[PDB]
Each structure stands twice: as structure tokens, then as C-alpha cells.
Amino acid sequence: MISLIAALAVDRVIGMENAMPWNLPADLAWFKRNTLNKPVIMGRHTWESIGRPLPGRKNIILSSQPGTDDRVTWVKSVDEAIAACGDVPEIMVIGGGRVYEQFLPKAQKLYLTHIDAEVEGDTHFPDYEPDDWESVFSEFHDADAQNSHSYCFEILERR
Ligand SMILES: NC(=O)c1ccc[n+]([C@@H]2O[C@H](COP(=O)([O-])OP(=O)(O)OC[C@H]3O[C@@H](n4cnc5c(N)ncnc54)[C@H](OP(=O)(O)O)[C@@H]3O)[C@@H](O)[C@H]2O)c1
Ligand SMILES: Nc1nc(=O)c2nc(CNc3ccc(C(=O)N[C@@H](CCC(=O)O)C(=O)O)cc3)cnc2[nH]1
Ligand SMILES: [Mn+2]
Ligand SMILES: [Mn+2]
Ligand SMILES: [Mn+2]
């Protein structure tokens, strides 16, 4: 099973200048809980944005060019990325925009954080078709001293 996990600001913005400008510790904790002990697939730009391997996960990087770091696994196509995960119950696709576009048609589950924040961005999560997806979990949180915007954790499953 393939799942996508992402955090979306207003208008589906996910990034600006190869960064995420907000800081929501509760959302990063959600990301870690839902990805730990699973393979994670990311594109090369997202690898550069994170800047280091994510511990406790098999890190798989898509790039058309040879890898430059043997602490992670480098692959050259979507099918190779999936194969490199092996026989696991759930593969997590962690972006960025181009990678999400390619994996969305193959995904059964979306883990989405909706952040109440207006962000100038240059990268968006794909337009997906709402009729294709059932919301099976949602949890709203107001802003607090650690998290400066309100946010909604949602899990959707392909109908
Ligand atoms: N808010 C969130 O949830 C979230 C999550 C992830 C990322 N982000 C943000 O998203 C932005 C990065 O997204 P992006 O769309 O620019 O880039 P990306 O999807 O992370 O990376 C694209 C790169 O991946 C490689 N690639 C993708 N598909 C491939 C394929 N089928 N075969 C081979 N290589 C492939 C290519 O690398 P080569 O050029 O080396 O061939 C391509 O240039 C950043 O702003 C980051 O902060 C946000
Ligand atoms: N829900 C969600 N939120 C995000 O912010 C997010 N970001 C990315 C891409 N960017 C990043 C940037 C940093 C870390 C990261 O350092 N995660 C640590 C959390 C511990 C910490 O630094 O606070 C991790 O171990 O997972 C992960 C993804 C991909 N999917 C996401 N999914
Ligand atoms: Mn092929
Ligand atoms: Mn197999
Ligand atoms: Mn806000």
C-alpha cells in the first residue's frame, strides 16, 4: 500500500524556495509517528530541504542522476522506488510536489495536515478529486504557545 503524507497551507501551498517557512512542532511529531519504521520516498529537492537522513526509516531518494550519499538509497524511477521498499505493509511518500503528483494515482491513503496559514509559495500539493476520497479521521487543534497556527489532521482513504 502506498500512502502520501503532507502538510498544506492555504491554497494547497507546501513550499517556498525549497523550504517550509512555518514551524508547527505538533505536526512534525505527527509526521514522525506516522512514518517511523516505514520506508519513506522523497524527491531530490526534498532531500536537500531536509538536509540529513530521517532516523528509523529507510530513506529512498528519487533522482535521475547518480546518488551522492550512501547513507540513503537512490533510485531512478517510480517503479524502482517501490521495489526498493521491499515487502512492507505501507510505503510513505513524503514529497515534494513533483513526487506527490506521480504517486497520487497509486495511493490508497492520504495523511494531510491542513494549516490555517497564508503562505506565498512556489510548490503545491496536487489537485486531487474530492469524490475519490473518504475522510476516516479528522482532529482539529487550535493554536497554542508552541504552535502558532490552528491545524487539522486528516486521514483519507480512496473509496
Ligand atoms: N509541506 C509538505 O508537506 C512538504 C513535503 C515535502 C516537500 N515539501 C516542499 O516541497 C518542495 C520541493 O518539491 P519539488 O516539487 O520542488 O521537488 P521534489 O518533488 O522534492 O523533487 C523533484 C526531484 O526529484 C527527482 N524525481 C522526481 N520524480 C522522479 C522520477 N520519476 N525519476 C527520477 N527522478 C525523479 C528529480 O531529481 P533530479 O533533478 O535529480 O533528476 C526532480 O528534480 C520544497 O519547498 C519542500 O520544502 C513540502
Ligand atoms: N505532515 C507533514 N508535515 C511536514 O512538515 C512534512 N514535511 C515534509 C518535508 N520536510 C521535512 C522537514 C523536516 C523533517 C524532520 O526533521 N522530521 C523529524 C522531526 C523531528 C524534528 O526535527 O523536530 C523526523 O525525525 O521525522 C521531516 C520532513 C514531508 N512531509 C511532511 N508531512
Ligand atoms: Mn521503467
Ligand atoms: Mn514483493
Ligand atoms: Mn494562521
Q: Please report the resolution in angstroms.
A: 1.0
Give the span between the Cα atoms of 113 and 154, in whole angstroms.
6
At residue 72, φ and ψ (nearest 5 deg) are -130, 170
Domain residue limits at 3 = 1-159
Report CA 102 to chain centroid distance, whole Å.
13
Which ligand is closest to the CA of 149, given by its number?
Answer: 5
Report CA 146 to chain centroid distance, whole Å.
22
What stretch of H or E contains 79? helix 78-85
The C-alpha cell 476520497 sits at 133
Give the span between the Cα atoms of 38 and 127, in whole angstroms.
26
Question: CB-based contacts of 158: which residues, under 8 Å, 6+ apart?
Answer: 107, 108, 109, 132, 133, 134
Hey, whose CA ends up nearest to atom 12 of ligand 1? 96
Query: Quick check: CB of 42 below 6 Å from ligand 2?
Result: no
State which approach was used to obtain the coordinates: X-ray
Residue 100 assigned as binding residue = yes
C-alpha angle 125-68-40 in degrees, rounded to nearest 5: 40
Tally of domains in the chain: 1
The DSSP-derived string for 94-146 is: ---HHHHHHHGGG-SEEEEEEE------SEE-----GGGEEEEEEEEE---SS
Query: Quick check: CB of 3 below 6 Å from ligand 2?
Result: no
Measured CA to CA in angstroms, residue 62 lies from 22, 41, 44, 94, 108 at distances of 25, 7, 6, 11, 20
Give the span between the Cα atoms of 97 and 131, in whole angstroms.
21
- Grid cell, residue 118, equals 497564508
Which ligand is closest to the CA of 75, given by its number?
Answer: 1
Residue 74: CB atoms within 10 Å: 20
Query: Quick check: CB of 113 below 6 Å from ligand 2?
Result: yes
